[PDB]
Structure 1
Amino acid sequence: LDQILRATVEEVRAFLGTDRVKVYRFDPEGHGTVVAEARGGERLPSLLGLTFPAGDIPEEARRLFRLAQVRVIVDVEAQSRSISQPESWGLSARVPLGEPLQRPVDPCHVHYLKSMGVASSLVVPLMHHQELWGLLVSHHAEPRPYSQEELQVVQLLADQVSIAIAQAELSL
């Protein structure tokens, strides 16, 4: 799995022509590791081999990854702010998306992304069945706006890998 993804991180990078793209896996204990990482003009250091703490993300945000399955961050310059809400469990049967064309994130990510010197941040969740196995993310300088039409093409690209990582769990 970790090896296979190594070729995926670079493969997708070619398509998304993103300078930096890495895959993030998750553990039940609340621990995640980077099993892949690519760099373009080497504007950022290699994070590969670094374990990220779950605390980095609560849950309400991850929920969107389950229902929204889109994950898109606008220019951190727009300074969008999104925090928690008072008693807002939101009861629904099953309505995919049904939210703004963008996903504002608390100032937590603002500095986080900016700290990486990345104005843009394209993310894509990798879920198999009803569970989440991995997470795809991309970061780079102003890569011009993104089209929804082209986004879909990649949206499926994230689904394909979902099969590779899933089929890998069996063998691995």
Structure 2
Amino acid sequence: LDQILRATVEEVRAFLGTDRVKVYRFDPEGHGTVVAEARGGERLPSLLGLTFPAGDIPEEARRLFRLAQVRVIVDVEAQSRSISQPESWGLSARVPLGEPLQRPVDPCHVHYLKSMGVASSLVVPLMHHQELWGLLVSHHAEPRPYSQEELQVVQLLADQVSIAIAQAELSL
């Protein structure tokens, strides 16, 4: 899979022409690693082989990817801020998403991206069945809204990729 996932990121970037796009594999201990990444004009350094700390994503946000499978970051210019709430109570996957066309990320995450030279990035999850295997994400150094039609291409492409993770898994 590590090999296939590598080629998958090469085709993805092409379709989305995104400067940088990487695949994120989720481990059972919460830790994840980068097994796929592509850079345009060496503009963005390589992070391949680097391990990211799960602490980067508590759990509430991670659930949304498995519950509603929908999350995107708007132009850091719009300064969108996110925060926790006492109401909590997450919504099941049985009921409709009922979420805004956009998702704000707390300031602590805003800078994290800014420090990465990212302004607007789309986060498409890679899952199979009821479990989550990994997470996909595209980085754009410029504002660019998404369309329902174009959204499917990528949103679907990811689903087609997540499916590869499942079928290929049987191999190993």
Count residues in correspondence. 172
TM-score (normalised: structure 2): 0.94
Q: Deviations over 1:108-154 (max 9, x none)?
A: 22111111111111110011100000110111211522223211221
**Residue 82 of structure 2: SS of its match in structure 1?**
coil
Tell which deviates more after alignment, 137-146 or 13-22. Answer: 137-146
Q: CA deviation at 1:68?
A: 2.1
Tell which deviates more after alignment, 39-48 or 128-137. Answer: 39-48
Extract structure 1 runs of 4+ deviating beyond 6 A.
none
**Residue 108 of structure 1: SS of its match in structure 2?**
helix
Q: Which runs of 5+ in 1 are unaligned?
A: none
Tell which deviates more after alignment, 88-97 or 37-46. Answer: 88-97
- Kept in 1, the 8 Å contact 2:68–2:93? The answer is no
Q: Which runs of 5+ in 2 are unaligned?
A: none
Q: CA deviation at 1:90?
A: 4.2
Q: Deviations over 1:69-92 (max 9, x none)?
A: 121111011111111101321455
- Kept in 2, the 8 Å contact 1:67–1:96? The answer is no
Q: CA deviation at 1:167?
A: 1.4
- Kept in 2, the 8 Å contact 1:24–1:34? The answer is yes
- Kept in 2, the 8 Å contact 1:31–1:54? The answer is yes
Measured in 1, the distance between the counterparts of 2:148 and 2:142 equals 17
Percent identity of paired positions between Structure 1 and Structure 2: 100
Measured in 1, the distance between the counterparts of 2:38 and 2:74 equals 22
TM-score (normalised: structure 1): 0.94
- Kept in 2, the 8 Å contact 1:113–1:121? The answer is no
RMSD of aligned Cα (Å): 1.4
Measured in 1, the distance between the counterparts of 2:90 and 2:28 equals 26
Measured in 1, the distance between the counterparts of 2:30 and 2:69 equals 21
